[model samples]
Target chain A: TRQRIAIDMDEVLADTLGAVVKAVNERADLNIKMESLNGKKLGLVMDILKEPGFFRNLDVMPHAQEVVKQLNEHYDIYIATAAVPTSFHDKYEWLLEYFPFLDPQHFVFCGRKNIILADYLIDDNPKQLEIFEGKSIMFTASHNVYEHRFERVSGWRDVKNYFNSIE
Target chain B: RQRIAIDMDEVLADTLGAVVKAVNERADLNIKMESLNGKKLGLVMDILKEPGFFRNLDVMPHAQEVVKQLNEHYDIYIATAAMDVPTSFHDKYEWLLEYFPFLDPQHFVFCGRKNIILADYLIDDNPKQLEIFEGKSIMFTASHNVYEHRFERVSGWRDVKNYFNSIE
Candidate 1:
């Protein structure tokens, strides 16, 4: 049987920060680049994360579609996201649009990440990685730049390379 | 230290009540819930797809208190099959938060099939879900599932309490 891989939605597959930065700049009238953010949550991420259409319009990470498509063939891929009421529909729609090939049954929309039972968890959140009882593959995001507890993947290409080397 | 996966719809939430409400509103018919079974049940359940239909479902009687007690003795997980209704994810999650606040948010599982979830037992109103579960399948009685008698059964929340209490 193929090993299961649990993948995080925000930052890993969806460019949530890019959308957040864009939304923040428009709302606060500040020119903040993604590079300026490191090791901390932004001032307004919580406020905006639950807004009606915030999650539906997130930009997909570069090369995420191609690499995930490739990974799907070899591994049982599950798109696991910690979602709230407002983000659920939008998040599902976003996944349907961008990652349509993924089996909808594999989608695990939950509040915390620890309940997931998988062989590998690829996520940008250290909190989630800390509790996962599997191989933790940290996907680099601005907030997790300093995190070194897990094997790291800087981009989708690195994710491909890491899996290739392991297999 | 066994984990029990509980289904939300007809087991914990009064989804049948809301479905009856929607069915009556849609067809201008005065229908009692007991009058619903077999074909009537299937016809009306499609109303679940309507937006916001599952948002404010009433909690099943004694569900909160019983589930809370069960939580203390066993690993509890609220596993709901919400994939068919694309709009149910938010409402079901919200409903669980409102009623079952004591449960850890991590234990809320939203998926299509209950078979994928790992548990020592599954208590569900739907026999189809119970049939596929790799656990002790405990059938929670409902109008739609009264015909299914293959699994160990409980009539209501109080019965659930008694069943677990006996085993303990």
Candidate 2:
């Protein structure tokens, strides 16, 4: 049997980047515009926009829970995310409030998501999942390129279908 | 408030005779066993040090009734020094439910050190434990070697109830 797949939280499952963009654009003092960084990479764009008020109004993506529920039946679903130590507790609280079924033990916060045993890697960030041993399925959102070497899906339903076909 | 702690074997249960009967029934029964000593039960048990001392034990008549009556006013606790098996608590729980029925799980406390746990009153067949407890210790009569000294004691469960009623 193949190893269990690991899914990223921010852009893949929840539209965290969209929320960040909305939050940043709403601020009158900064007055940053939400635009696709043409030809420019996601990491560089995020690096430039890494300010205090960027993620203040972060919101979860639609159909996020439905997709996770479907996937949990087949695989051991784990929410692996990266956040600062100070914000980790609040994030955990947020997760508990949002997904009451999520066991506290399964949620892992790490500096890097690089683990050798992972069978599959699902993330919005193509670069992070590229190095993983398992198949990487990119959940299509802003900043994703179709011509990327790894598999990229337009929606969660397509991703589910892809997993079903492979398994 | 005074707490009453009681022992199970020989004190609240007729254990010795049942054990002897079972032992004698076995195919490899070579040893002749005498009747339980109505005086010094603890000393006799110590002298024998037999593993199957109280194998087929049964609760003494009126014991459950007496414990239930006393439990209404006093904080009743069973303090037995018997080896605690994994199923010991389950057995006790079942026994209490079948017999007493009214006693709660919180009322039962099991441990090796009976006197150290601070029970004001102790009703036991073991004279040594009664002596250690000192305060309102009732040395219940046992079926073993007889002792000349008649300290504060009860022959049966009715006598125990009578003693407590007199105090009230």
Candidate 3:
């Protein structure tokens, strides 16, 4: 059987935290710098990221939806994201609330993402998903680390082209 | 919509003969590679990329008529695994248009992985591509080296039309 390809959410598909930045900046009292917030560690980062109404107006990255639609036609696609166990329910709920096309089972919340076995893992995190036995394509984002082990793609079209070349 | 993906090299154009003539003219050598005798297309391609290749290539006899007829009903797409020279899709596309005037930019796909693209059917002379597709494949029977196996196969362009018409 053909192996499935897993995709990540935060930076790979939607910019949930970008929405948080917008909301936080709109509030006159708590003017937070988006860059400063993003540069922090994930555990403390989500404390600020997971607040209510933070992702109510989340927006998907350009061409991400189109790339997913094309890839879904060929491979079994699953959405894999990282979150604390306590905040898992809220994260999954927000994802479903924002993107109705995705199912709940596809949403994975855990400390580590590399544990999942997939033919390809598309993620933006610098802490490379634990070298899962498949090819890793790093989605190019502002904070992504340029690593020799993974293929870096600047946009969704680049991701599609990379898969086409390999497949 | 009925979609048809056809190969370019030997099926539509005489790329091998062109390569042979170009080599003989430039180097004054008659270096004949015995690997292209049958349907070892992968090997043939590896050799074709050598310098002074593709000068003697010519269009196949029935290519125009077959493509014309196939285009009437099928959404025709010319798929070729041949790497584009100068690494430009436009250059390869213009070269193909010079011969097949009816073809449009959208109808051509230049890539090695033709099977990965969404296509209902593929007609090609290369047996490896047929094996990879493992779907509705119509083998153009000019090449003699195809390994016989327990699968449905067609011998010519007319058979391609017949196969598609009979399918539900």
Candidate 4:
């Protein structure tokens, strides 16, 4: 059977935390960095995410633009994102421009993660991994670097290398 | 190059029987499943507000093997009108796994509107969904949709498979 690889969007690819950190820094002039977000950042991210344009204009995670496209060659890549109704259309459009290779059917925009069934789930959320049944690859996020319940990958390069070894 | 979108309710899942079972179990009316064959299940029954109501639908007879046959050629998507019942969302997921283990939950589209989906074919009992589909719509027979004459109709999976075979 062909391997079906599932990925979460917010941090694993979209660099959502980076966007949050930058947003807080620019809007309110707060001093926060990628390292400053460990365990203590969600407290601030909750506020930053509520601001308008918080989900828009996110940078792609390091080296994932090519890694995701390349992974499609070796595996069936599907994206699963936890988004509310207000964010669904924007995120859907984001994927269309960012990852056009994938069809609308290849994505699941929802409030929960239990709906996705794949061989591997690459996500930053521990709660998502808790509900997933497959092999969990904890995508290294700013906040979850300290909590290591599953195998971790820092960037898309690590992801490609890991999958290459497994393949 | 094209995808085949299938409806879950009366087309693949035996929603009529589930409604009939629940109806007979709870009501004084001695209504048969066939008696309610050509009418809308939504208007006839109001128990969908109850949790697990959408989860317990039995797989329609012959849908399993028939879909497996069509699966060889088409991108089989179980596009059901499910977002209305937020509580039964996971239950619908569990229901699919319970019956059709071959289908991935990712292939399921639990949305309120069907027009947004881009596909070459949509097999549904609801004419409103079928009418809006940009591609060729194959109407699956149901009590509510039997009167609808705008699209081609298939009475059962036997008819469904034959329709596909009759095509290219």
Give each candidate's interface RMSD in Å. Answer: 2.0, 22.8, 17.7, 8.8
Candidate 1 residue pairs in clash (backbone atoms < 3 Å): none
Worst 10 residues of 4 chain A by lDDT: A108-117
**Candidate 2 Cα deviation (angstroms), residue A127:** 2.4
Residue B74 in model 2: lDDT: 89
lDDT against the true structure, per candidate, is: 0.84, 0.60, 0.62, 0.74
Q: Give the winner by DockQ.
A: 1
Give the alpha carbon lDDT tens digit for every residue of A15-111 in model 2.
6766655555565345545356433333434542454433333466676677777777777555656643234444555666666665444454433
Compared with the true structure, what per-residue lDDT tens digits does model 4 show for residues B85-106? 4456566767878877886666
Going through the candidates in order, the fraction of native interface contacts each one reproduces equals: 0.56, 0.00, 0.00, 0.00
| Candidates by lDDT, descending order | 1, 4, 3, 2
TM-score of each: 0.83, 0.42, 0.46, 0.54
Ranking by TM-score: 1, 4, 3, 2
Residue B161, candidate 4: C-alpha displacement in angstroms: 0.7
TM-score attained by chain A of model 2: 0.76
Off by over 4 Å in 4: A1-167, B41-46
What's the C-alpha lDDT at position B71 in model 1?
Answer: 91
**Against the hidden true structure, what lDDT does model 2 obtain?**
0.60
Clashes (candidate 4)? 5
DockQ of 1: 0.42
Deviation from native of the Cα of residue B16 in model 4, angstroms: 2.2
Which candidate, 2 or 3, has the higher DockQ?
Answer: 3
